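Cross-posting from the chemistry board since nobody answered there.

I work mostly on the small-molecule side, so proteins are not my area. We synthesized magnesium ion and want a rough idea of how it might sit in this target. Sequence and SMILES are below. Is it possible to get a predicted 3D structure of the two together?
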Amino acid sequence: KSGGSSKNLGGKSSGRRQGIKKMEGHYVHAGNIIATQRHFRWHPGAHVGVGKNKCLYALEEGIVRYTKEVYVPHPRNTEAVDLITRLPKGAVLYKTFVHVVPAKPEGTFKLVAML
Amino acid sequence: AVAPEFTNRNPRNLELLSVARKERGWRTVFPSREFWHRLRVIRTQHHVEALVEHQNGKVVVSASTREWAIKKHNVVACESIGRVLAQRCLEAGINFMVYQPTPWEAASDSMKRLQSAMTEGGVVLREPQRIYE
Amino acid sequence: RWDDSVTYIFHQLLDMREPVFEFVRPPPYHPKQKRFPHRQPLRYLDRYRDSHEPTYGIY
Amino acid sequence: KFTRSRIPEKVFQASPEDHEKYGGDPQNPHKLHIVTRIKSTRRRPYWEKDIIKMLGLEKAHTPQVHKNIPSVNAKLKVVKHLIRIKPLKLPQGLPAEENMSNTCLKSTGELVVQWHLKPV
Amino acid sequence: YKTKPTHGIGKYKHLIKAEVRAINLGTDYEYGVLNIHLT
Amino acid sequence: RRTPPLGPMPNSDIDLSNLERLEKYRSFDRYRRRAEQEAQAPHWWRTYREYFGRTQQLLERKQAIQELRANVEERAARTASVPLDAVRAEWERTCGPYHKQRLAEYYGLYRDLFHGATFVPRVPLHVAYAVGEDDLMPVYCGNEVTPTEAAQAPE
RNA sequence: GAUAGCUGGUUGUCCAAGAUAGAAUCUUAGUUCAACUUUAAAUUUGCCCACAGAACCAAAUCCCCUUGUAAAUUUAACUGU
RNA sequence: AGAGUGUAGCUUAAAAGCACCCAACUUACACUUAGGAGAUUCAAUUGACGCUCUGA
Ligand SMILES: [Mg+2]
Ligand SMILES: [Mg+2]
Ligand SMILES: [Mg+2]
Ligand SMILES: [Mg+2]
Ligand SMILES: [Mg+2]
Ligand SMILES: [Mg+2]
Ligand SMILES: [Mg+2]
């Protein structure tokens, strides 16, 4: 027995727990993490921030909603521009975005005093 | 003779009060939806267009060479369109916009003259931040 | 918008205390106060006080 | 892996031959069923046991009535292999305030309101 | 998603034929890569 | 489990094996226009617009005027004048209502004042507050006028 | 009367609830946390839930109103697995 | 010579978008910067004139 005992070590990693934390229809508050995962899964949509680990987190109190909108990234990403140019005429990427439909308003004009 | 709580419906009130919430998202997507009065400039063949859309997509003020008016009398046409748009936005109430062109488009002389004319007309392109708290 | 002519009109040809507003924002969220925050900082108790001043029961 | 066994839509689709074989009909269908457990809850998954407990069928060979609605329909289908279903057809009017002490279930679903103890 | 009716809404790999050497068929009605030197 | 698509999926009518014989986007403005046109569509699955959603004579005269203006050359194109009073007069006399209706719709005038039923203004209008003999404060569609300047009836 | 992750045993009647994903440990014949289970109490939602929602390189699964129900969260205990 | 078509090369809104070209980056094609060009053959769908099938 040599060269085939257990030289292929290293595979002893636990689960990273990276998925969806607030499914669609849930009343998420401002600041809660919506999901965490590697590689841009759900691109940022309306009222959805992005941290450093390519994660998402709600910014306003509302219900989470997912749609399929066209993808038009920033010209900075030369790789994205190249991939787009490599597509034919009638071609669309259609990525998965995330939205947060706001419920409450930003404020209300209340009566202070009668002068 | 006053209600316990006031209720305003003017969509422009919150937009001008610097309190209307913007689309903080759309970070990886271009252009960014965080604004109140985006100034989109379209350049086509034989004509030029400059729009001032809204977050919902409603055009408020704009100017085109096909207006059977300014067509009378191509950086000159761009400057004229910019001046007309600035005057219309001033007489209409708009005074702040956000222009997010492309690098090859921002490094152009036409866009430079357009921005110069817009600034001379009396319109700032910065849009103050949204007051929180 | 607001101006001094508005107040002049109100106090001259209206005869009634004019109203005043401030546009108040909704209060903070602050979820249910947990008994054992465990991983929360010392500022956890600061989010549920009224208000900072030294309050003492009976002595 | 033994997952939650589902049922397609082609199964629950009564055909003219099925209607001719039995007595039921599509137009003006029954409104209540006669649930009667004929199989134990043991040797079956836990969700089936929970469904049986919710339906109230602890004592087997006992009659039970439930609403004939999509929700209850699926709840029944979930354990169809453990319960007997039959329609509750009332020959006469529903049990009035006066017909509540003298009643009877009778097999083949026939709730009689004038339950007596004499021969015809 | 797979089960949802919106499956394959962002399949773009097949739209790009990512990767000329000696490729001169000449069998059927075809002409291989040509060269024209502009002296 | 695999379900069929209700409507036609995108990029399905151009998924031919002859991808090299297609146009292939060589720029970014064309792709932006295509994306805008696609977003401006109903779509059968989802979209961002779900939760947050006599003439011949005039044409001949315009062509003649354009030809005359072009032949007048001006030489200052290589940086010109281009007045504004004539343009303003034309806008107020020609397509003034075209933009006035858009402004009213953006401000919510027809849906709030008339409770719907939009229309187009036929005859123009001009109003300006008089801050004495001069200067005069104009009241344009959406101008910011102070209550002090509005202390008297305008002209 | 040493210690000892170890062998052995640990006294009358009856009722009820009562089977565990894993991690660390000079550690896998032992210990802790977590999880299961028990007692008294304050709260309201616990499970199958229906349209829909949930990825480029097959049985399925998550949220899920009406609907069957009466179960669930927490507080204070502590042995047992 | 019987019949058909009739906004520039393409699109039905009948005066627009694509499409095209010279000058610069380009060894070269291109994305770009600055410039150029254009149609309704006429009568208050109606009849005649560029073009299409019939030893013509
Ligand atoms: Mg592995
Ligand atoms: Mg001892
Ligand atoms: Mg030991
Ligand atoms: Mg022993
Ligand atoms: Mg003893
Ligand atoms: Mg027991
Ligand atoms: Mg150690």
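Reply from a structural biologist on the board:
Welcome over. Reading the output above for you: The two ends of chain A are 96 Å apart (CA to CA). Strands of chain A lie at 27-28, 33-35, 48-49, 56-58, 62-69, 95-102, 111-114. Happy to explain the token format if needed.
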